[PDB]
Scaffold this active site. Sequence first.
Site, short mmCIF file in Angstrom:
data_model
loop_
_atom_site.label_atom_id
_atom_site.label_comp_id
_atom_site.label_asym_id
_atom_site.label_seq_id
_atom_site.Cartn_x
_atom_site.Cartn_y
_atom_site.Cartn_z
N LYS A 13 0.86 -1.18 0.00
CA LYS A 13 0.00 0.00 0.00
C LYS A 13 0.89 1.22 0.00
O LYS A 13 0.77 2.03 -0.94
CB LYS A 13 -0.93 0.04 1.23
CG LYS A 13 -2.14 -0.88 1.17
CD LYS A 13 -2.98 -1.01 2.44
CE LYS A 13 -2.26 -1.19 3.80
NZ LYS A 13 -1.54 -2.43 3.89
N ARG A 88 -8.91 1.48 9.67
CA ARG A 88 -8.31 0.20 9.98
C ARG A 88 -9.36 -0.63 10.73
O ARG A 88 -9.15 -1.82 11.01
CB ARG A 88 -7.07 0.59 10.78
CG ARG A 88 -5.90 -0.30 10.90
CD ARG A 88 -5.25 -0.47 9.55
NE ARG A 88 -4.03 -1.19 9.85
CZ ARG A 88 -2.82 -0.64 9.74
NH1 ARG A 88 -2.66 0.57 9.20
NH2 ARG A 88 -1.77 -1.35 10.12
N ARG A 123 12.08 -5.47 4.13
CA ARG A 123 11.73 -4.07 4.05
C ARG A 123 12.73 -3.19 4.80
O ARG A 123 13.20 -3.51 5.89
CB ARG A 123 10.35 -3.84 4.62
CG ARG A 123 9.93 -2.38 4.74
CD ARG A 123 8.42 -2.17 4.83
NE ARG A 123 7.84 -2.68 6.08
CZ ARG A 123 6.53 -2.68 6.36
NH1 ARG A 123 5.64 -2.21 5.50
NH2 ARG A 123 6.08 -3.15 7.52
N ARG A 156 12.28 -1.20 10.38
CA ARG A 156 11.33 -0.89 11.41
C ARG A 156 11.47 -1.93 12.52
O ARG A 156 11.76 -3.13 12.33
CB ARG A 156 9.95 -0.88 10.80
CG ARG A 156 9.69 0.46 10.13
CD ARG A 156 8.34 0.55 9.48
NE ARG A 156 7.31 -0.16 10.22
CZ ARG A 156 6.15 -0.41 9.66
NH1 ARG A 156 5.88 0.05 8.46
NH2 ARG A 156 5.23 -1.12 10.27
N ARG A 167 0.34 -8.96 13.78
CA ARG A 167 -0.36 -7.98 12.97
C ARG A 167 -1.29 -8.65 12.00
O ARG A 167 -2.37 -8.11 11.78
CB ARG A 167 0.61 -7.12 12.16
CG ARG A 167 1.43 -6.16 12.99
CD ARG A 167 1.81 -4.96 12.11
NE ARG A 167 2.87 -5.11 11.11
CZ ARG A 167 4.16 -4.93 11.41
NH1 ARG A 167 4.55 -4.87 12.67
NH2 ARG A 167 5.09 -4.90 10.49
N1 LIG Z 1 4.34 -5.61 -5.91
C1 LIG Z 1 5.24 -5.97 -4.99
N2 LIG Z 1 6.02 -7.05 -5.17
C2 LIG Z 1 6.92 -7.36 -4.25
N3 LIG Z 1 7.29 -6.71 -3.14
C3 LIG Z 1 6.58 -5.56 -2.97
C4 LIG Z 1 5.52 -5.17 -3.86
N4 LIG Z 1 5.00 -3.97 -3.39
C5 LIG Z 1 5.68 -3.65 -2.32
N5 LIG Z 1 6.66 -4.55 -2.00
C6 LIG Z 1 7.50 -4.48 -0.82
O1 LIG Z 1 7.16 -5.30 0.29
C7 LIG Z 1 7.23 -4.51 1.50
C8 LIG Z 1 5.85 -4.06 1.98
O2 LIG Z 1 5.27 -3.11 1.11
P1 LIG Z 1 4.62 -1.79 1.68
O3 LIG Z 1 4.40 -0.90 0.55
O4 LIG Z 1 5.53 -1.38 2.72
O5 LIG Z 1 3.20 -2.43 2.09
P2 LIG Z 1 2.12 -1.85 3.10
O6 LIG Z 1 0.90 -2.54 2.58
O7 LIG Z 1 2.15 -0.41 3.01
O8 LIG Z 1 2.52 -2.46 4.54
P3 LIG Z 1 2.07 -1.84 5.96
O9 LIG Z 1 0.63 -1.58 5.80
O10 LIG Z 1 2.17 -3.03 7.02
O11 LIG Z 1 2.93 -0.70 6.32
P4 LIG Z 1 3.57 -0.13 7.69
O12 LIG Z 1 4.19 -1.33 8.31
O13 LIG Z 1 4.54 0.91 7.25
O14 LIG Z 1 2.50 1.02 9.14
P5 LIG Z 1 1.28 0.22 9.29
O15 LIG Z 1 0.12 1.06 8.91
O16 LIG Z 1 1.09 -1.26 8.61
O17 LIG Z 1 1.00 0.07 10.85
C9 LIG Z 1 1.93 -0.46 11.79
C10 LIG Z 1 1.34 -0.19 13.18
O18 LIG Z 1 0.84 1.17 13.27
C11 LIG Z 1 -0.46 1.11 13.81
N6 LIG Z 1 -1.53 1.81 13.13
C12 LIG Z 1 -1.41 2.42 11.94
N7 LIG Z 1 -2.53 2.91 11.51
C13 LIG Z 1 -3.48 2.62 12.42
C14 LIG Z 1 -4.85 2.82 12.42
N8 LIG Z 1 -5.51 3.48 11.44
N9 LIG Z 1 -5.48 2.29 13.47
C15 LIG Z 1 -4.79 1.79 14.48
N10 LIG Z 1 -3.50 1.49 14.57
C16 LIG Z 1 -2.86 1.92 13.47
C17 LIG Z 1 -0.67 -0.28 14.46
O19 LIG Z 1 0.00 -0.34 15.71
C18 LIG Z 1 0.11 -1.09 13.42
O20 LIG Z 1 0.50 -2.40 13.88
C19 LIG Z 1 8.23 -3.34 1.22
O21 LIG Z 1 9.55 -3.81 1.43
C20 LIG Z 1 8.04 -3.12 -0.29
O22 LIG Z 1 9.25 -2.65 -0.92
#
Ligand SMILES: Nc1ncnc2c1ncn2[C@@H]1O[C@H](COP(=O)(O)OP(=O)(O)OP(=O)(O)OP(=O)(O)OP(=O)(O)OC[C@H]2O[C@@H](n3cnc4c(N)ncnc43)[C@H](O)[C@@H]2O)[C@@H](O)[C@H]1O
Length: 214
Positions: A13, A88, A123, A156, A167
């Site tokens: 994403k 979320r 990542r 991270r 997660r």
């Molecule tokens: N097509 C493809 N082919 C192959 N490889 C590919 C690819 N596309 C991408 N890749 C790669 O694979 C990897 C992943 O891609 P990436 O682009 O990083 O994927 P993502 O879907 O964005 O992953 P995340 O959603 O888990 O991101 P995040 O960890 O930064 O913060 P998060 O919101 O999750 O949240 C973390 C914490 O924050 C919290 N939090 C955040 N938002 C909220 C909310 N709204 N409510 C409550 N808690 C929240 C919670 O505590 C949560 O646990 C990268 O290395 C990338 O290069």
Amino acid sequence: MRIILLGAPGAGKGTQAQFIMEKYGIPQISTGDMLRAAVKSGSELGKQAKDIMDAGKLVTDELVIALVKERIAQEDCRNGFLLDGFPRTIPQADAMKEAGINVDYVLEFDVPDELIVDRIVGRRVHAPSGRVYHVKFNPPKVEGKDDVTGEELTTRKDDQEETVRKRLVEYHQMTAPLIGYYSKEAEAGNTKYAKVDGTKPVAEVRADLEKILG
Ligand SMILES: Nc1ncnc2c1ncn2[C@@H]1O[C@H](COP(=O)(O)OP(=O)(O)OP(=O)(O)OP(=O)(O)OP(=O)(O)OC[C@H]2O[C@@H](n3cnc4c(N)ncnc43)[C@H](O)[C@@H]2O)[C@@H](O)[C@H]1O
């Protein structure tokens, strides 16, 4: 143009959010980025997420809705924005409803559970900007350095195998229901819903997205 990105941990994403932002000039509002930043600044709104994110758990809805309402209020969001990581949970989606924040497109990035743990161990991020790389799948032009600033990339803290597993379970329990939520919204004519194959190569996912958005 207002867009929600929906998808399991590591579905790509954040990687696609940087392309939509640069190509369509709409700001990316990423709640993961805003919360790691708050934890790192000791900002009163958000420093509380430190231990929750470490454990792999979702931060309280009440906290995260407060951050997003604040951000949407900044002058860059009057002409659209991209929500990456929010809503979320169904309370966060209802809160957007109650508040008059309707969106144009909801895009679901579908990836099998079995691919997630290896995506996330390769990542590497540039934390100040939130740009994200993968050592194999989407590496920086110079190993270990961000493309734009030449700054050293980091991992991270919550990207280890057991926190990712946690997660994934919280995703299936709390967030996966938003697929049915917004599919019902699209049926009613309130938004457009598009599912994309997140297993395709990054550039290919990028090309499916241009077909959907212009
Ligand atoms: N097509 C493809 N082919 C192959 N490889 C590919 C690819 N596309 C991408 N890749 C790669 O694979 C990897 C992943 O891609 P990436 O682009 O990083 O994927 P993502 O879907 O964005 O992953 P995340 O959603 O888990 O991101 P995040 O960890 O930064 O913060 P998060 O919101 O999750 O949240 C973390 C914490 O924050 C919290 N939090 C955040 N938002 C909220 C909310 N709204 N409510 C409550 N808690 C929240 C919670 O505590 C949560 O646990 C990268 O290395 C990338 O290069």
